[PDB]
Homo-oligomer: 219 residues x 2
């Protein structure tokens, strides 16, 4: 099923609760929260304290993407904060992804795994096929760290490979998604769409959300 998730990194961080309400009001399915620690990626955004404050104001699904070096140390804080989805990077969980997925699920959060552009898609197959698997795979379509970057079409091959092997798996894409890039992504098989500037910078955000949904549903 299609899930449109505005990237709050592109919203007014100073009026988060209002922005969250506005997005839900405009049709958003989830709110994508980019958590960066300045180490895994060269940018620092928000952490669990922000998620906790936001949860007090909304019941919306908070899709948290951990671009941090030590995701295991965020499981407890984010679960307490009220995170709904917890997506970690495959590049920093090579020795403990099994326990990490289990620890996330134990806390009632939906486990997901993300991969940077340079990481071969085959690396996440074991995580999708595990006894306790990830329930979402996030294919980054730009090098993670900043919004406003150029969509990388070559990443659609990863989306396609995943959709072919796993027809019911939630496949998310993040990086340059918007009206001009949604069709190729929807055709490739992506059903969860993270978009920032294309939604918040639009004259009609609600129309953009609907257009993204329609493209996915059309595929």
């Amino acid at each position: 099923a299609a899930k449109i998730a505005p990237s709050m990194l592109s919203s007014d961080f100073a009026n988060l609760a209002a922005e969250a309400d506005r997005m839900v009001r405009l049709g958003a399915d989830w709110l994508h929260m980019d958590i960066m620690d300045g180490h895994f990626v060269p940018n620092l955004t928000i952490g669990a304290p922000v998620i906790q404050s936001l949860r007090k104001h909304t019941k919306a699904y908070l899709d948290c993407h951990l671009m941090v070096t030590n995701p295991s140390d965020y499981v407890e804080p984010l679960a307490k904060a009220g995170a709904s989805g917890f997506t970690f990077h495959i590049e920093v969980s090579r020795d403990n992804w099994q326990e990490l997925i289990q620890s996330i699920k134990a806390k009632g959060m939906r486990p997901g795994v993300s991969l940077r552009p340079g990481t071969p898609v085959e690396e996440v197959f074991p995580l999708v096929e595990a006894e306790n698997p990830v329930e979402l795979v996030l294919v980054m379509t730009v090098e993670p760290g900043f919004g406003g970057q150029k969509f990388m079409p070559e990443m659609m091959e990863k989306v396609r490979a995943l959709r072919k092997k796993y027809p019911s798996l939630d496949i998310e894409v993040d990086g340059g998604l918007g009206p001009s890039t949604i069709d190729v992504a929807a055709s490739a098989g992506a059903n969860c769409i993270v978009a920032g500037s294309s939604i918040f910078g639009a004259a009609e955000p609600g129309e953009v959300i609907s257009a993204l949904r329609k493209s996915v549903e059309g595929s």
Copy 2:
């Protein structure tokens, strides 16, 4: 001169613009922004993207405290974001402190340096005495990372030492400051007061801010 700086780490992160404005209306001189990267301290809070959005909603002095391992990489982003004060930790700015101070000042921000409880106060004397010196020294009165911890009276010896040598230097304290601990800190010589839970958790925050200011001015 006394400066009262509420610690936004204790505020409603989902209504930052409103909280900042409320603090200013209640008499806050500066807004203390704790930037933690999960590495220098075991917590991740907010980064330049949050500061940038807040600046669009306030003209208040944003006193940013960098509890990160690589402060040099935040100078440009925070300057663009509108930070007013940029305080780095002496424990991670080694051999690069002279350049760091110059880079901060070169970008229109006020340079400051902070020291954890375990760090001898003598460590910062050269920075205060340099040709292009720090303009504020932040004596942590709790181990940095979280709000609500117990004030450490023993840290007042650092404050006193600094005040004795530098009569006009801004000396800031952060950690457990409130009505019950301000007199001993004001007597020691601290004039810039960072307080979180004692202000955001108070029935009369305006009265608390005034009391903190009165204590400092009384000294």
